[PDB]
Design a protein around this ligand. Structure first.
Ligand SMILES: [Zn+2]
Lengths: 88, 50, 86, 339, 151, 550
DNA sequence: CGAAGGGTTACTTCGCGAACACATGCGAAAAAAACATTTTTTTATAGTAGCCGAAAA
DNA sequence: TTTTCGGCTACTATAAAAAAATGTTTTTTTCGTTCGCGAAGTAACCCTTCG
């Protein structure tokens, strides 16, 4: 049960509470979709003083950041071109 | 129960069950303390197996 | 249950803080002599979940390790030589 | 209970032999079970239980009838029968009705002796506490054990069966011989124990019987006078007859006082007299009041002269109560000013 | 027993009228209602005028009483002084009360702060008790039902 | 009972639930259990995660670690014991998790106050130039600008970079911030102790004072190195008179925005207090003041060298002295008239600013001087914290609990019998509000023995203050409130995933005709209003938690 | 050269067990309040506590 | 000088609506038969340091 009130009123007609929650949803859309296009190579080759992660990051140069949609479109085109037996 | 009055019961243990451990009997000491006494059906689990 | 109900009524009803501390210290003592008893005594020990595990009559030393088995019998013995030793 | 496999709803029987005693069915034989497993207001009722314990152990009653009076008092307090008494009369009345349930030997005076209360107020509260019953079935009309247990503390004899059995026989024969209907069971016990002791070869002082039997001295003599009146008492001196035939000519003296009833010094609903015609004739007028001129309307009040003498008499005699009333009003209007 | 046995209604009445008198003494009268130039560069460039009561509050009590327990020898006034500077007054050292920082809102909420105001408020203004409701019944999901949750 | 009471998440982990409940909504399925095992144990190596969680071998743990490294939710350490095997040991970082808390109301608060470059519909590029820096971590112009084909906007983006990096907000060299604060102090103390053997016979004074003063000045120049830099160099080689070099990686969100946010909190404090023309002047004064102010996190005491000795008073002496010395900030009304508000005794602006700036004193806000040239704050932020706590406890139940808490704090820790003197009611409601307050752990109890025997009948009681434990309790309470709110919002996400995703797939060009039945239109609009309500309450709850942070 | 900051060994006081079977919240001053008694008006009616005279020697 | 049997005195009980002076049971404030071994408060004495 719940007796008290810690005053979190919603003023949804204000401009800033609309725009700030829209930017929240946009930030969630950017982060939940994972990384971005080929600008993470700088993140890979930062390598301040790091032998082990300087071995880790060139392993994940070809990580699933933005090439999953193109591979999925190529697989959909190959499925529309011919039949293939695999699990979905 | 205990004694002779109610029905009766003759316990073995705390110095007596150790004798068949000194012999090395395994299935007698298991049976006469589990199966002949009380066979119960506790259900268990793997994830939080209470 | 009753002392916790009395606390739940009296604290939002409003009573004296010394009586509150006395009744709540009685709450603290009743749990302490409800489990792991015979440390306080204001047959008059009560049995909780430590006299059932203490020894020689508890669930360790006479009800679990040495338990009263079935299919037994107890009678005095007379000698007889004419039986083999088996 | 009717849980079985081959049959349904049969009887059962736990075994007597082999020290096995399982609850088994019949005519096929299935145990059909497992092995046998064998092994605020309360403070007011506590004060009432202690007071009932006191009156119970003082009045010499057994222990079960104490709990019977306790549950009777609990049911009565659940019906909200009384409040605010001194509780001696209440506990005595509850133990009296629980005690006069049973045929034991306890009358009203044994309760009226405690706390020195008059017996009539205790009986009045006993008929005030019957505003819960609407049953009132009490077997009260048998004063036979009174004779059996009064003869232990009074009329001490070497035998105490020869006097007692003939006493209760003569008393029941006299009660069936029209001498007992609301006619003092302790008194008839004293009377047909003095008569049976007179049959025995031992006499009593008349005070010794009426002392512990809680009966008056004159009333038992009136009883024995009526025994001399009814029974011829010639054969009663030596030995009573083994075949006593008593038919007719039997009455209490209330029948005599109705037989003389002074001193010389076709049912129909419409034939019954109607009572509304007497009220219908005389007028219901609050304004008409002057039709009673029969020398009484002109003789109510006298003049002013012989009235200040009456006022003088009243102020001279009934003075202290008026002074206490006026001083009590002055005491009030003193001590209600502050808070 | 001047203020001890004084419960309860005229303690509140005397509290309300001394709150009104110090709010109209240590600040001007009607410039707390609207924001159309409040108080005119307060107390005329807030220098050396800057005064307070200094026994004038007991003179205002002397202006009007009901003659039962209301002859206070500057000690029940000090008790109510302690009762007011621990809730809503600051009271820099001697007698300068400074009633403000909650007087304006819950004084001019009645017939001074009507609907259709000036500008929308910033989210979570801490010094504000007004317009906080959440349900006709509407308590379905995680609305403001969060506080302390019976730990 | 029936799990709808929400107790399986209620009376459990208050602190170790938010830090990896955020990354359930941000990172995903396997980049959350790494934080859930790292915070729950503390110090972890590489193989220890693999032997703890049975999710994968040492292949996909690398992906989570190199996804959380530049997001600075985790910091590393490469060291050996005595022999070798130079493996990377791992603490857990907190500042990246604060960035994942604050990101949206970082980007939506900075524009109206700090960055005054341009306002003629530049919101289409602020999100692209800021959110891509938070969601990636670094900034290299030769790879980041290469997505933009135009060259005319490149000079404007470079000027935005210059003016936004003038006021901090982007750590320039971006080195050494993946190292622990305690490890820096221990390493510098160890290095500054190894340099002096075979000398005069040592003492506590000579060794301790020499090693600690050298460690303080070296750690101070280390922490002040990334604060002020000159990497924006080689002006006009062929064009572009003010250009930032693109070689050095460039991180985001220095805590000067946190300093500005508590500055906005103090502006709200001054607005609800006297004046409000004091608010309209002191807002523009303090938003110019707080660029050089001392930092909230306060290094040189984050490492456990706070002991009850000369080091403890040296911290307060430093907080009094450095705040006056290192900013300077020679601020007057002639400095305020340079950045003067449009139409905000309306005429004769400068003397009015003199009188309003000189009238804002006593209490401790804007501590002045005859001929003032600065403004301190050392006894103003705890006053803000206490005042926010007291108006929250006024929001708890009635004004009476707020009166009772403030009177206990103000009459210096007094017993119970004299409380009825400074009160309204005699006994009933004061015990009611004291019971409802003693359910919280904010006003303590004190027991004294009367006959040297502990008995709860013969004892007199008084009430301790204990403010700091109450601030910690409110801090973890607000943290649990945010964690419970975002967990319920994540449940609201995951119970309605497929109908949001079906409209997300291909209905974007058909949002007008809505391409669906009107029932799920109402369902989508209702869950959108739910998400708007949750974020609108989360911003306020986040600010109320943000007051309680020191 | 002398007063002061940890640092440990030494004396003293507080927690458990002793076979293995058998058949024998309580108490104690008062306080607001819902309530009966106690009338007097008879008055029918029996007798049961207590009181002297006509009866026998 | 002794007993017994008839005259008066009269109070209990139920029923009536009548209404006043005065006494009668539950609550809310406060409290006085070992002995052996292992572990935890107060003192006696060195290592080291500043005025
Ligand atoms: Zn059968």
């Amino acid at each position: 049960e719940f007796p008290s009130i810690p005053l979190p009123i919603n003023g949804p007609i204000t401009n800033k509470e609309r725009s700030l929650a829209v930017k929240y949803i946009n930030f969630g859309k950017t982060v939940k979709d994972g990384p971005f296009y080929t600008g993470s190579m700088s993140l890979i080759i930062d390598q301040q003083e790091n032998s082990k992660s300087g071995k880790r990051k060139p392993n994940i140069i070809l990580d699933e950041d933005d090439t999953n949609d193109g591979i999925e479109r190529y697989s959909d085109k190959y499925l529309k071109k011919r039949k293939i037996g695999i699990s979905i | 129960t205990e004694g002779r009055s109610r029905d009766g019961g003759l316990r073995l243990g705390e110095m007596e069950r150790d004798c068949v451990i000194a012999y090395g009997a395994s299935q007698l000491l298991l049976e006469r303390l589990m199966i002949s006494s009380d066979a119960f059906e506790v259900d268990v689990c793997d994830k939080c197996g209470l | 249950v009753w002392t916790s109900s009395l606390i739940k009524a009296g604290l939002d009803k409003g009573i004296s803080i010394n009586n509150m501390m006395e009744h709540w210290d009685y709450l603290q003592l009743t749990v302490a002599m409800y489990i792991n008893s015979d440390s306080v005594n204001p047959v008059k020990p009560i049995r909780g979940f430590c006299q059932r595990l203490k020894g020689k009559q508890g669930r360790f030393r006479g009800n679990l390790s040495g338990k009263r088995v079935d299919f037994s019998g107890r009678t005095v013995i007379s000698p007889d030589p004419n039986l083999s030793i088996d | 209970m009717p849980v079985c496999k081959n049959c349904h709803g049969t009887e059962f029987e736990r075994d007597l032999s082999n020290a096995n005693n399982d609850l088994v069915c019949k005519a096929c034989g299935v145990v059909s079970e497992d092995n046998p497993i064998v092994s605020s207001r309360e403070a007011t009722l506590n004060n009432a239980r202690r007071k009932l314990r006191a009156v119970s152990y003082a009045l010499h009653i057994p222990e079960y009838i104490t709990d019977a009076a306790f549950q009777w008092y609990k049911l009565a307090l659940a019906n909200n029968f009384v409040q605010g008494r001194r509780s001696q009369n209440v506990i005595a009345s509850c133990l009296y009705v629980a005690c006069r349930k049973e045929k034991t030997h306890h009358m009203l005076i044994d309760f009226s002796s405690r706390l020195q209360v008059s017996v009539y107020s205790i009986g009045a509260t006993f008929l005030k506490m019957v505003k819960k019953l609407h049953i009132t079935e009490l077997p009260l009309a048998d004063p036979s054990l009174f004779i059996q247990h009064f003869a232990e503390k009074l009329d001490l004899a070497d035998k105490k069966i020869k006097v007692v059995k003939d006493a209760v026989k003569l008393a029941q024969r006299m009660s069936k011989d029209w001498m007992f209907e609301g006619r003092r069971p302790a008194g008839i016990a004293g009377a047909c124990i003095l008569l049976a002791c007179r049959m025995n070869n031992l006499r009593r002082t008349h005070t010794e019987i009426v002392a512990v039997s809680h009966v008056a001295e004159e009333t038992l003599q009136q009883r024995l006078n009526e025994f001399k009146n009814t029974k011829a008492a010639k054969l009663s001196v030596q030995k009573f007859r083994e075949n006593d035939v008593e038919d007719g000519e039997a009455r209490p003296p209330s029948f005599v006082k109705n037989r003389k009833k002074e001193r010389k010094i076709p049912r129909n609903l419409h034939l019954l007299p109607t009572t509304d015609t007497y009220l219908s004739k005389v007028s219901d007028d609050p304004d008409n009041l002057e039709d009673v001129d029969d020398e009484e309307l002109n003789a109510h009040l006298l003049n002013e002269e012989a009235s200040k003498l009456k006022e003088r008499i009243w102020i001279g005699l009934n003075a202290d109560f008026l002074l206490e009333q006026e001083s009590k009003r002055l005491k009030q209007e003193a001590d209600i000013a502050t808070g | 027993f001047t203020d001890g046995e004084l419960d309860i209604e005229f303690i509140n009445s005397l509290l309300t009228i001394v709150w009104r008198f110090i709010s109209e003494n240590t600040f001007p009268n009607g410039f707390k209602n609207f924001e159309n130039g409040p108080k005119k560069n307060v107390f005329y460039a807030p220098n050396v005028k800057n005064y307070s009561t200094t026994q004038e509050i007991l003179e205002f009590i002397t202006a009007a009483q009901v003659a039962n327990v209301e002859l206070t020898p500057s000690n029940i006034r000090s008790l109510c002084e302690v009762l007011v500077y621990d809730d809503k007054l600051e009271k820099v050292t001697h007698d300068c009360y400074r009633v403000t920082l909650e007087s304006i809102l819950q004084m001019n909420q009645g017939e001074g702060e009507p609907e259709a105001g000036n500008k929308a408020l910033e989210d979570e203004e801490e010094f504000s008790i007004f317009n906080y409701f959440k349900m006709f019944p509407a308590s379905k999901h995680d609305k403001e039902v969060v506080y302390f949750d019976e730990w | 009972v029936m799990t709808i009471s929400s107790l399986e998440q209620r009376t459990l982990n208050p602190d170790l639930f938010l830090y990896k409940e955020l990354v359930k909504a941000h990172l995903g399925e396997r980049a959350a259990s790494v934080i859930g095992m790292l915070v729950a144990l503390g110090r972890l190596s590489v193989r220890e995660l693999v032997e703890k969680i049975d999710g994968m071998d040492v292949d996909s743990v690398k992906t989570t670690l190199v996804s959380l490294t530049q997001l600075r939710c985790v910091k590393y350490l490469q060291e050996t014991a005595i022999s070798g095997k130079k493996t990377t040991y791992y603490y857990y970082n907190e500042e990246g998790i604060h960035i994942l808390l604050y990101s949206g109301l970082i980007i939506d608060e900075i524009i109206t106050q700090m960055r005054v470059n341009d306002e003629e519909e530049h919101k289409q590029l602020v999100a692209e130039i800021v959110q891509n820096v938070i969601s990636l971590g670094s900034l290299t112009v030769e790879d980041y600008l290469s997505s933009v084909t135009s060259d005319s906007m490149k000079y404007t983006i470079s000027s935005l970079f210059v003016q936004l990096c003038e006021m901090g907000y982007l750590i320039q060299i971006s080195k050494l911030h993946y190292t622990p604060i305690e490890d820096l102090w221990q390493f510098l103390y160890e290095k500054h102790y190894k340099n002096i053997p075979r000398n005069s016979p040592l003492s506590d004074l000579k060794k301790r004072s020499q090693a600690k003063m050298n460690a303080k000045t070296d750690f101070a120049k280390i922490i002040n190195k990334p604060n002020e830099l000159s990497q924006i160099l080689t002006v006009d080689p062929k064009t572009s008179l003010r250009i930032v070099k693109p070689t050095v990686s460039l991180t985001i969100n220095l805590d000067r925005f946190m300093k500005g946010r508590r500055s906005k909190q103090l502006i709200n404090l001054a607005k609800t207090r006297v004046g409000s023309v004091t608010a309209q002047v002191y807002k523009i004064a303090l938003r110019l003041t707080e660029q050089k102010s001392p930092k909230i996190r306060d290094p040189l005491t984050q490492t456990g060298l706070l002991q009850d000795l000369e080091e403890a008073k040296s911290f307060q002496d430093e907080a009094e002295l450095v705040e006056e010395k290192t900013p300077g900030l020679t601020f007057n009304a002639i400095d305020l008239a340079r950045h003067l508000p449009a139409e905000l005794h309306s005429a004769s602006l400068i003397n009015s600013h003199l009188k309003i700036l000189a009238s804002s004193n006593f209490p401790f806000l804007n501590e002045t001087k005859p001929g003032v040239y600065y403004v301190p704050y050392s006894k103003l932020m705890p006053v803000l914290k206490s005042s926010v706590y007291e108006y929250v406890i006024a929001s708890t139940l009635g004004p009476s609990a707020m009166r009772l808490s403030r009177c206990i704090r103000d009459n210096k820790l007094v017993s119970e019998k004299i409380i009825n003197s400074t009160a309204l009611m005699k006994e009933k409601d004061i015990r009611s509000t004291l019971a409802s307050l003693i359910r919280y752990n904010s006003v303590e109890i004190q027991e004294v023995p009367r006959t040297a025997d502990r008995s709860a009948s013969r004892a007199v009681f008084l009430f301790r203050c204990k403010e700091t434990h109450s601030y910690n309790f409110m801090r973890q309470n607000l943290e649990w409130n945010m964690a419970n709110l975002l967990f319920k919002k994540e449940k609201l996400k995951q119970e309605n995933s497929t109908l949001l995703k079906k409209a997300n797939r291909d209905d974007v060009k058909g949002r007008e005709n809505e391409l669906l039945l009107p029932s799920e239109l109402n369902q989508l609009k209702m869950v959108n209003e739910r998400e708007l309500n949750v974020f609108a309450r989360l911003s306020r709850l986040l600010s109320l938690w943000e007051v309680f942070q020191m």
